[PDB]
UniProtKB/Swiss-Prot annotation, chain C:
Signal peptide: none annotated. This is Transient receptor potential cation channel subfamily V member 3. It is found in: Cell membrane; Cytoplasm; Lysosome. Abundantly expressed in CNS. Widely expressed at low levels. Detected in dorsal root ganglion (at protein level). Expressed in the keratinocyte layers of the outer root sheath and, to lesser extent, to the matrix of the hair follicles (at protein level). Non-selective calcium permeant cation channel. It is activated by innocuous (warm) temperatures and shows an increased response at noxious temperatures greater than 39 degrees Celsius. Activation exhibits an outward rectification. The channel pore can dilate to provide permeability to larger cations. May associate with TRPV1 and may modulate its activity. Is a negative regulator of hair growth and cycling: TRPV3-coupled signaling suppresses keratinocyte proliferation in hair follicles and induces apoptosis and premature hair follicle regression (catagen). Belongs to the transient receptor (TC 1.A.4) family. TrpV subfamily. TRPV3 sub-subfamily. Homotetramer. May convert from a homotetramer to a homopentamer to allow pore dilation. Interacts with TRPV1; may form a heteromeric channel with TRPV1. Interacts with SNX11; this interaction promotes TRPV3 trafficking from the cell membrane to lysosome for degradation. It comes from Homo sapiens (Human). It comes from the Eukaryota. It is linked to Olmsted syndrome 1: An autosomal dominant, rare congenital disorder characterized by bilateral mutilating palmoplantar keratoderma and periorificial keratotic plaques with severe itching at all lesions. Diffuse alopecia, constriction of digits, and onychodystrophy have also been reported. Infections and squamous cell carcinomas can arise on the keratotic areas. The digital constriction may progress to autoamputation of fingers and toes.
Length: 515, 113, 113
């Protein structure tokens, strides 16, 4: 009721009232509706621009007011904002209107009780639509331009260069958008959020500077770690010059164990999906590393089980090589395809197969007569373990099919064998190929983004390993975006678009040539 | 094969399949083939003085050959090898089958489609 | 600025000036924009048919002028031209308009460096 609300404000209504009730701050999303508990935010979150304009023009309205959560007007819009299919981008338009009316960075830099800015809150809650607007934000009108996050320093025809603000989006700060959008576990759209203009280019620029060399260096150390471990285990007794290699495996295993011990500790994995999507290689590397340590511990004692742990380290160590498939788009997209295939199809297929494998294993071994005193190997299906082994070899096409077993019901025994073949060789084995093709089609259209999401996690981890010094590989230095002593670290992106053909009157430098 | 539309389009299909899928599949398979080859041959005891052919996984070359025949479904699967940890030895064999026969071999068909 | 450019030509502006600067002839596609270094080609490559018509009608305009690369107006359009998803086929329409105005095969048969 815009007309009714208009006269209430003139009558002396409190435009700064806070609705701190339980309904306005629900614990869940079904028993209440959170909008900022303020009349200014209520109209903003309900797509009522006319009331918002009336409220902002009022002299007694506190735009920078904070609610119980510490959220300002901008924070409430971020939480309220949803996908384009749900909301008609009214929050993004409302976010621009309110920010321009204030005309200051105080509202944008305000932190709630969780210490998160509205820019940081978008990454925390996974609001790609709001994050895209804020990260790439141009204010064409004059008298207020420092509020922009995207600046075009020069433009000549279709070729133009854009500068993206990185004051709060970089690894320099303690908590930033880039760090949140990669290590987040409460959202499932990180790969879509990494495709933004500043975020995608920032990861690429730092990848080719230090991350590429460190990733190759890490592979070489790990490749030599497994090569040396394999040689000493394979060529084991059943010296004084090769002792350095043996000590390398023990020392490097400790380095992996310590690094993976703290990496999992600080990651705080809670959900099962987070284990397989963010920490699967943090465990298998840790498991492989501690197996070598365990083998050394058992080696010096009288236990002979050290060899068993040593072999497991070899098999797992070479299996861990598939982590380094990332960095390459072809191999990286192949690796992420394996993970989806294993979880969606392989694990599902194995569960049913084992039931048929064990179900027919007991049945086939049941109708087997005892071998005569003359021949003690009358039937290959002597016991349950033997029956499963024969069926397992039958599935993989190994050995010979001898139906002349010592079965009291040979017709019944053969009937179950043929049924097992139809269920497994014809039905289960063949359907697995068809089912994966459905998953391959669904993943191939998004596996490229997933690989970059997995790779981006490696970039941040490598950057944290860097010491306090050596951080000279940052982006372009301070640029005079605004003459009022406004210098920001910006990333230069050049784009060509033969679409609009506008007149460039909102540039920073008249000369188009880079200098 | 070119000159004929049916055979020519078939030939160009092979080139894309080889580069996009076959070469990518072979690289991962060799890592699993060689990775399990050293592991399986590691826990193999020396054959007794009586029988010199106690285990078919005598060396690294023998271990890879047996696994290669296992992948292509040739020969017989004899798990009664001269392994000091038969349960561990069989555990790696089944893991290799799942990774190669069930996972790698089957996914290649889906990826090429 | 078609209106501003119109009075400049009448004032005595050089319609055959060559912008031989480094920016106008970049080594790559990110630090500069190549269009033919001439005002006639600049309007042609920027989808400005009105300025192109005004420039062509001028008696002092050299349609067959060659830049440092030896490219004529038609060569510059070919280099500037992109796919339909990127450019709204304005180069193809501009190519026809300029060629018909000249009405000769000298422009089409010219070879660059
Ligand atoms: C090879 C036999 C393996 C045997 C073991 C089995 C292992 C099997 C598992 C996986 C396969 C193994 C994959 C390799 C992993 C490490 C390499 C890597 O990804 O880093 C990079 C290092 O690229 C360079 O070499 C460039 C310079 C780095 C060297 C200098 C180091 C510091 C001095 C290569 O990546 P890229 O994509 O070429 O980077 C180019 C940049 N681009 C993406 C923008 C184009
Ligand atoms: C122009 C380029 C300049 C480059 C300058 C470089 C300066 C370097 C100087 C100092 C930094 C030292 C950091 C600790 C290194 C030891 C830790 C370790 O085990 O290595 C780690 C990496 O580290 C490497 O092997 C790469 C070198 C670092 C282990 O490798 P990873 O791949 O992390 O382990 C598996 C991945 N996982 C976590 C998913 C399981
Ligand atoms: C053979 C290498 C030929 C040269 C590279 C061929 C190739 O496409 O490799 C691919 C991987 O592939 C590898 O680099 C892994 C295989 C090489 C190691 C084994 C060599 C034989 C022993 C390179 O993948 P890409 O997609 O070019 O990686 C760049 C990523 N980008 C395109 C997003 C920037
Ligand atoms: C079972 C469920 C597995 C789910 C994870 C699959 C997976 O990551 O697949 C990967 C393929 O590479 C592999 O890891 C697949 C091969 C695994 C073989 C296991 C080792 C056997 C060796 C003996 C074992 C002895 C054990 C002794 C104890 C996919 O690679 P990715 O997509 O790059 O990585 C995904 C994970 N991340 C997103 C967190 C980085
Ligand atoms: C012989 C030993 C063989 C190897 C065993 C290795 C250890 C295995 C044990 C545990 C590892 C973790 C398993 C679960 C992983 C996370 C969930 C997941 O991906 O589920 C998948 C299904 O998965 C199933 O339906 C699982 C069926 C049983 C799995 C075990 C098979 C072997 C049993 C002996 C998801 O499938 P989806 O189509 O994406 O479903 C949509 C998601 N939704 C379900 C949330 C709606
Ligand atoms: C995924 C895996 C997870 C879990 C599954 C692990 C298998 C479960 C049973 C363990 C095996 C077992 O008890 O075997 C017994 C039979 O016992 C049976 O006959 C087993 C009946 C249960 C399985 C029936 C089908 C279930 C589907 C004994 O087997 P046997 O071959 O007679 O033993 C040799 C003789 N010996 C006893 C002298 C040593
Ligand atoms: C609910 C009711 C349903 C079924 C219950 C039947 C119980 C019968 C019990 C005694 C018979 C038995 O099991 O043995 C028989 C096999 O038996 C079969 O072949 C079983 C078939 C089961 C159902 C098949 C449905 C599909 C038909 C598919 C048709 C496939 C071809 C069927 C060709 C006939 C034959 O026995 P034998 O081995 O000759 O015995 C010799 C030893 N003795 C002389 C010491 C006894
Ligand atoms: C079939 C082989 C069996 C043995 C295989 C052994 C293993 C080797 C296997 C290899 C795989 C590829 C097999 C096929 C390639 C051989 C055929 C060939 O070159 O085709 C040619 C046949 O052209 C003629 O027949 C032209 C007419 C006669 C030519 C006379 C030459 C001059 C004579 C003296 C003066 C090309 O013609 P086309 O492709 O028919 O043209 C189709 C296009 N069209 C329909 C529009 C016209
Ligand atoms: C390995 C990577 C191969 C990449 C090329 C694949 C290819 O051309 O496929 C072709 C399939 O026809 C073949 O060439 C099939 C055989 C491929 C492997 C060679 C086996 C040689 C056997 C003996 C080994 C002896 C070893 C002796 C010592 C070395 C397709 O060819 P196309 O459709 O004509 O297109 C490609 C050709 N082009 C350049 C015209 C575009
Ligand atoms: C020793 C021999 C290899 C000699 C031929 C190398 C051919 C490389 C080029 C190629 O098509 O590789 C392919 C994979 O390729 C890989 O990533 C695997 C490379 C081989 C690894 C070793 C296998 C044994 C390229 O992968 P893709 O998914 O086709 O990449 C998209 C194509 N694009 C890069 C043009 C956008
Ligand atoms: C394709 C190109 C790749 C080719 C690579 C092929 C393998 C490389 C080694 C050659 C074989 C060798 O030397 O075997 C030796 C074993 O001793 C070893 O060398 C043990 C194996 C070392 C690590 C390899 C396994 C993991 C590879 C990870 C996979 C990633 C790398 C591949 C993908 C890029 C020979 O010893 P033997 O077998 O006992 O010999 C019997 C006779 N004699 C005892 C009298 C001497
Ligand atoms: C890691 C946990 C096991 C570490 C090794 C210590 C246990 C051990 O002795 O080896 C285990 C390997 O291991 C298995 O049989 C289980 C498979 C390991 C990975 C499971 C996932 C048990 O092996 P085993 O063959 O029972 O060892 C006794 C040998 N015997 C059967 C001749 C008496
Ligand atoms: Na077979």
């Amino acid at each position: 009721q815009g007309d009714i609300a208009a006269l209430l404000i003139a009558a002396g209504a409190d435009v700064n009232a806070h609705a701190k009730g339980a309904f306005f701050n629900p614990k869940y999303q079904h028993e209440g509706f959170y909008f900022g508990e303020t009349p200014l935010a209520l109209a903003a979150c309900t797509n009522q621009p006319e009331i918002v304009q009336l409220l902002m023009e009022h002299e007694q309205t506190d735009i920078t007011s904070r609610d119980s959560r510490g959220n300002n007007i901008l924070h409430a819009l971020v939480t309220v904002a949803e996908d384009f299919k749900t909301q008609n981008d009214f929050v993004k338009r409302m976010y621009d209107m309110i920010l321009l009316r204030s005309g200051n960075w105080e509202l944008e830099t305000t932190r709630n009780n969780d210490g998160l800015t509205p820019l940081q809150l978008a990454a925390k809650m996974g609001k790609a639509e709001i994050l895209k607007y804020i990260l790439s934000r141009e204010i064409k009108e004059k008298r207020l331009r420092s509020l922009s996050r995207k600046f075009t320093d020069w433009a000549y025809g279709p070729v133009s260069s854009s500068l993206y603000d990185l004051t709060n989006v970089d690894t320099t700060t303690d908590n930033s958008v880039l760090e949140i959008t990669v290590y987040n576990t409460n959202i499932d759209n990180r790969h879509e959020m990494l495709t933004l203009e500043p975020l995608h280019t920032l990861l690429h620029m730092k990848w080719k500077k230090f991350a590429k060399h460190m990733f190759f260096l890490s592979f070489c150390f790990y490749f030599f770690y497994n090569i040396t471990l394999t040689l000493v285990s394979y060529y084991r007794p059943r010296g004084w010059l090769q002792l350095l290699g043996r000590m390398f495996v023990l020392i490097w295993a400790m380095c992996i164990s310590v690094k993976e011990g703290i990496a999992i500790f600080l990651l705080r994995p809670s959900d099962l999906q987070s284990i397989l999507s963010d920490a699967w290689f943090h465990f298998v590397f840790f498991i492989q590393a501690v197996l070598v340590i365990l083998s050394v511990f058992l080696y010096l004692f009288a236990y002979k089980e050290y060899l068993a742990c040593l072999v497991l380290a070899m098999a797992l160590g070479w299996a861990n090589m598939l982590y380094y498939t990332r960095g390459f788009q072809s191999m990286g997209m192949y690796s992420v395809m394996i993970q989806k295939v294993i979880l969606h199809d392989v694990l599902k297929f194995l569960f049913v197969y084992i039931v048929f494998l064990l179900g027919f294993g007991v049945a086939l071994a049941s109708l087997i007569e005892k071998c005569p005193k003359d021949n003690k190997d009358c039937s290959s299906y002597g016991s349950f373990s033997d029956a499963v082994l024969e069926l397992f070899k039958l599935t993989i096409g190994l050995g010979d099919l001898n139906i002349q077993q010592n079965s009291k019901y040979p017709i019944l025994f053969l009937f179950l064998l043929i049924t097992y073949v139809i269920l497994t060789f014809v039905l289960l084995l063949n359907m697995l190929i068809a089912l994966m093709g459905e998953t391959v089609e669904n993943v191939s259209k998004e596996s490229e983004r997933i690989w970059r999401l997995q790779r981006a996690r490696t970039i941040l981890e490598f950057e944290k390993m860097l010491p306090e010094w050596l951080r000279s590989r940052f982006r372009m230095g301070e640029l005079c975006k605004v003459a009022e002593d406004d210098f920001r670290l910006c990333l230069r992106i050049n784009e060509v678009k033969w679409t609009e053909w506008k007149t460039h009157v909102s540039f920073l430098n008249e000369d188009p040539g880079p200098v």
